Design a protein around this ligand. Structure first.
Ligand SMILES: [Mg+2]
Lengths: 140, 113, 140, 140, 140, 140, 140, 140
């Protein structure tokens, strides 16, 4: 996208023209084979806007002078967006069944925390030190 | 043996700081990440009453000074050398119990004379 | 929304026009793909009003002079609202079945506490230090 | 491929011709017997681009002067690409059933982490010290 | 095969004629009763090429001056190839069922690691000290 | 067999006539009531050749001056061959079912290692100190 | 049998007449109600020959000057033969079902080792100190 | 029986008339309500002969000057015979089902050892100190 999702703050996202937002929305939709096509454009925009805001507030600043977002900020924000869309869709499906067959996926339930709870959130955690507390300071 | 003691005191006579970084079974920490932590904990710029503030995933371990009886190695070495050179043990700035007194003293100083 | 949910206290929410409330309700409805369309407007207003009140009373003040709401206050209040709407709708659904097929979602049961018990509450916890006790004081 | 995936950074990937990208996409598709044929070329491109970016940002640098990517960088990036495509497909299938029979696969959920969650990510981990913390430094 | 798989590096594999690659591919196919016949020749070539590259990069060098590949290098590379072809096919099948009957195989899920996860990888591990850390050095 | 399987190294196996190989293959087939008759002669040759090679490389040398292959070398190589043929046939079957009835075998899952994973490998382990570490040396 | 199975070594078994072997085979068949009638004469000969060889190599010699085969050597070799025939016939059945009814046997899975894994091997273990390490030596 | 099973060694059993053996076989058959009628007379003779041999070799001698067969030697040898006939019949049945109904028995799997594994062997163990190690000696 022309403005990239890592170049955009919450205030910037609101200032983007519809096409520039839809270009980023299109990029997030590439993170699922289904593209979440049955979830409305406004829900995808809310997921992205809240991923951007959450990056800038919860995954910002430093630990021992190191950036707390160590990974690529574009793909971190995209995985964080995909994580949110998957939660708006009701969660990560463990089993599916119907007229046309059945499947079960090896999720293993995961841990208790927010990002542990879907595949996109598990990807996002690797970009942010897996939510570990590496920070250190000293008296001068 | 003297050279061995000097090198052993240098390595083992003094405790050394071991900062361990990251959570066990957690995210790995690379050399460039440790360079920043080294800058915070540098013994060159630390002082006696420095205090440290950290998250839970930083551990300031220590290599204790590992006790060994270099004094007894010195006494043994000096006893070997002085006796080999036919001098009394006392010439080497080393002493022994009982041997400073009575007929035990009289013998060794008679032998020297 | 023109007045944003983070700019609005319980007393302010009651003073809003119907349109200003419905604009905020519309924003909360973006956090589920279903929009909870079968749950009445007045349930949604109660969930938002009680999310606002719970923010201002339980997730307010400081710990070691850090703000106890570290995350974005807008999205925290929206997730806390979505959590409440989902608990008015029953629980978080773990399995669904009918004429048109079946699905199971990987909820993993989770912990015992209120916010742990829904996907929205799990998101909300990340904004408030995951309910941890970081507070400290000195004597002088 | 003429430019190999280990010779290509994120900025280089964007600069490649359609044919050079499709040549690498074709290589990644060789890591499944299905080739993920029912996923769009853009899903595969996004998976590769984000595998390249994640290599260069998360699996780069040194530990005790050892390179942190110890294994072959080509097959590491390919397995990391395959891992992402399989997560875009909803995850690793544990059981499958239909009109034509049924199968279940030895999987067992793995561990909690991202790369543990798929066979491709389990392969990728062996190239990067299995995500272990071997780094060491001295003072001078 | 005329050039044997243990005599061939990644660069050599690329230099081989189609026939003498197919000669090695044919040898790997002897490690399954099914021969993985429904997988394309290119899947098998990719599995072999990446087994060769993985041998030379992850299972190379010494521990306490012992070679890290203690077993026969031919059969190690063939089992490592078979392990990869089996992972390209999904997992190791634990249960199979259909019109013609049903079977379950004893696997026990294995451990969490890559090579533990299929029968060919369990065989391969015995050639490489079961991935144990026997290395030692002195100072002088 | 005229040349016995314990009298034959990998290089010798390759030098045998077809009849001498088929005589040894015939002996290995006596280790199953089914003889694995639906598995090709070339699978069986590969299993035997790799059993011979594996004996000579992994189950050779001494521990505490004791030979590491303590048992009869013929039957060790035959069980090691049968273990491999059984892994080429899938796993060890734990349950079987169809038109003509059903059976479950008391395999119990067992341990994680290669030889523990089928009945023939469990037999083979007794010949090699159950893979224990009895070796010892002095300094003179 | 005229020559008894405890009087016969591996070399002697090969030297026996067909009738002397069939007389011993007939004795081993008495250890099952089914006599393993659907398993060929040559499977049974292989089981007996390998029981004889395994007795002489694995269950021979002394521990603390006591013989390691403390029990009756005839019945030890016969149970060891029956153990092998049962493994050649796929393992010990835990459940059986069909047109004529169903049964489950109280096997309990047992331990991991070879002889623990069928009823005949459990009998055999009692003859050989249950595979315990009673051996002792002095210096002089 | 005129010669009782406790008065008879392995050599004596072979010397008995057919009628004297059949009289003991008839006694052993009284230990099951079914009498194991669908097993050949030769299976029963083998079970008794091997029970006699096993008594005289494994359950003979003294511990701390106490006899190691503390119970009645007749009924010990009969239970040991019944234990063997029951193991020739498969295992001990845990569940049975068919045209005429179904039953499950409260066996509970039991322990790992030979005699623990059927009801007759559990009875036999009480006669032999439950296989405990009471033996003691002095120096003089
Ligand atoms: Mg990680």
């Amino acid at each position: 996208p022309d403005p990239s999702i890592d170049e955009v703050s919450k205030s910037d996202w609101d200032a983007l023209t519809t096409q520039e937002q839809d270009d980023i929305i299109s990029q997030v939709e590439n993170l699922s084979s289904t593209g979440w096509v049955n979830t409305s454009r406004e829900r995808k925009a809310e997921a992205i806007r809240s991923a951007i805001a959450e990056r800038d507030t919860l995954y910002s600043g430093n630990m021992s002078r190191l950036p707390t977002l160590d990974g690529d900020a574009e793909y971190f924000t995209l995985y964080l967006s995909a994580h949110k869309i998957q939660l708006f869709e009701g969660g990560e499906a463990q089993s599916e069944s119907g007229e046309g067959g059945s499947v079960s996926y090896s999720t293993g339930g995961g841990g208790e925390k927010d990002l542990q709870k879907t595949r996109y959130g598990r990807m996002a955690l690797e970009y942010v030190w897996e939510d570990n507390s590496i920070a250190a300071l000293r008296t001068y | 043996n003297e050279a061995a003691i000097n090198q052993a005191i240098e390595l083992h006579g003094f405790p050394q700081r071991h900062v361990k970084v990251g959570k066990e079974d957690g995210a790995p920490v690379r050399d460039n990440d440790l360079r920043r932590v080294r800058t915070i904990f540098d013994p060159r710029t630390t002082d006696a009453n420095t205090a440290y503030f950290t998250g839970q995933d930083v551990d300031v371990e220590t290599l204790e000074a590992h006790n060994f009886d270099y004094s007894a190695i010195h006494e043994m070495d000096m006893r070997n050398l002085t006796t080999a050179l036919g001098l009394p043990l006392e010439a080497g700035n080393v002493g022994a119990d009982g041997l400073g007194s009575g007929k035990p003293a009289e013998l060794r100083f008679a032998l020297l004379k």
